Amino acid sequence: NLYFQSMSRVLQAEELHEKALDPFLLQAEFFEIPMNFVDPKEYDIPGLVRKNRYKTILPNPHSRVCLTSPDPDDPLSSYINANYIRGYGGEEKVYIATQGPIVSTVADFWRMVWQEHTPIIVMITNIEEMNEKCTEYWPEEQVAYDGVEITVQKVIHTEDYRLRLISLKSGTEERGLKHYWFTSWPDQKTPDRAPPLLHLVREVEEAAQQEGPHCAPIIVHCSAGIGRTGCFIATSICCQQLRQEGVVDILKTTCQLRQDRGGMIQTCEQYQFVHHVMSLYEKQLSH
Ligand SMILES: O=P(O)(O)[C@H](O)c1ccc(-c2cccc([C@H](O)c3ccc(Cl)c(Cl)c3)c2)cc1
C-alpha cells in the first residue's frame, strides 16, 4: 500500500491445487499486477551503465542496497544493482535480490557480502548459462577482493545444487558463507519440474534458521535478479505462510516483492510455476 495498492487472493488447499492448473485465470491475475519498474532516468550517474547487466532492470531507490565503503557519498562507488527484500510477515531485509555479477561488478558483489554479513547466497543459473547470465565470481581455491580473503573450503555436489562452504577473512575477523548454486532451473515449468526448487527452498530456510537470531540478509541472484529470484523468494515466503496460517497468498506475496524490487516474478510461466511448487508442498505437508 506504499508504492501501489496491494492485491490478495488467500488460497486454501483445494483452490491452490486447481489454481495451479488454470493458466487462463493465472494470466488474468498475473498481468493485473504492476511491474513497478524504475524509470532508467532515475539513475543518471556517470559510469552507471557498466554496473548493469540490463539498462531497464534497475533497483527501486527506496530499498536499494548502498555500498557504504569506501565512499558512501560517491553515487558510483556506492552503487550495486540490488534491493533489500522483506520476508514473511513483512520482516525487513530477510533477503537481498541482485543481478548475477558481471566482470565489472565481481568486487562490488563481495563488498556487499561483507557489508551485509550475508551467511547464504542462492544462485539460480544453469551450467550452460555461465556465459552471459553470471560470471564465475568465486575462486577455484582462494582470491582477495578489497582486503577480504575469500576461500572455497569445500564443494558439495548434490543432484540439483552445488554447495560451496566459503571462508571470508579480513584482519582478525573470519566468517562462514554457504553458496547454493542451483542447476535445475527448467525452461518448461511443468508440475514435474517443481520438486528440485522446493528441495532448494526447504534446505535454504533450514540453513537460515541455523544462523540463529536476527539472520543477516540472504543474497539471491539470477541473470537480472527478478525472475527466478522472485520465484525463489515468493516460494520461501509462502512455505512459511502455509506452515503458520494453513493458507497461501501468492498474489499478495508477489505484490509485496514488487514493492521492494520492480519485476519480481517476471513471467506468467514463472507465476504458474510458483503455484505448482506451493501446490506440491501443500500435498507433502498434508501427510
Ligand atoms: O529464465 P526463465 O524465464 O525461467 C527461461 O524460461 C529459461 C529457463 C531455463 C533456461 C535454460 C537455460 C539453459 C539450459 C536449460 C536446460 O534446457 C535445462 C536445465 C535444467 C532443467 Cl531442470 C531443464 Cl528442464 C532444462 C534451460 C533458459 C531460459
**HEC string of 160-176?**
CEEEEEEEEEECCEEEE
Distance 54 CA to ligand 1 centre (A): 19
- From 187, 231, 268, the mutation candidate for ligand 1 (largest count of ligand atoms within 8 A of CB) is 187
Single-letter amino acid, residue 285: L
> Which residue from 53, 2, 26, 46 is spatially nearest to 221, judged by alpha carbons?
53
**Side-chain-side CA neighbours of residue 191 (13 Å):** 14
Ligand 1 contacts CB of residue 195 (under 6 A): no
User: Does residue 268 carry a catalytic annotation?
Assistant: no
**Side-chain-side CA neighbours of residue 208 (13 Å):** 23
d(CA 224, CA 100): 7
Q: Which residues pair with 95 in a beta bridge?
A: 85, 218
Full residue range of the structural domain in which residue 190 is found: 1-287
Chain breaks in the chain (C to N over 2.5 A) after: none
> Which residue from 260, 206, 268, 205 is spatially nearest to 231, judged by alpha carbons?
268
Distance 124 CA to ligand 1 centre (A): 10
Nine-digit cell string for 260:
521492494
CATH of the domain at 185: 3.90.190.10
SS3 50: helix
Q: How many domains does the chain have?
A: 1
Ligand 1 atom with the smallest distance to the CA of 273 is: 4
Q: Which residues pair with 181 in a beta bridge?
A: 123, 162
d(CA 167, CA 177): 6
For 61, counting Cβ atoms within 10 Å of its Cβ (0-12 exposed, 13-18 middle, 19+ buried), the class is exposed
Q: How was this structure determined?
A: X-ray
By alpha-carbon position, which residue is closest to atom 11 of ligand 1? 187
Contact residues for 75 (Cβ-Cβ < 8 A; gap 6+): 45, 48
Catalytic option among 134, 215, 222, 231:
222
- From 127, 130, 181, 185, the mutation candidate for ligand 1 (largest count of ligand atoms within 8 A of CB) is 185
By alpha-carbon position, which residue is closest to atom 5 of ligand 1? 187
d(CA 68, CA 4): 29
Nine-digit cell string for 211:
544462523
Contact 250, 237 (CB under 8 A): no
d(CA 48, CA 185): 30
How do strand 173-182 and strand 120-124 relate by DSSP bridges?
A: parallel
Contact 274, 266 (CB under 8 A): no
Q: Which residue do the cell numbers 550452460 mark?
A: 128
What is the signed CA dihedral for 282, 159, 125, 211, rounded to 10 degrees?
70
Contact residues for 1 (Cβ-Cβ < 8 A; gap 6+): none
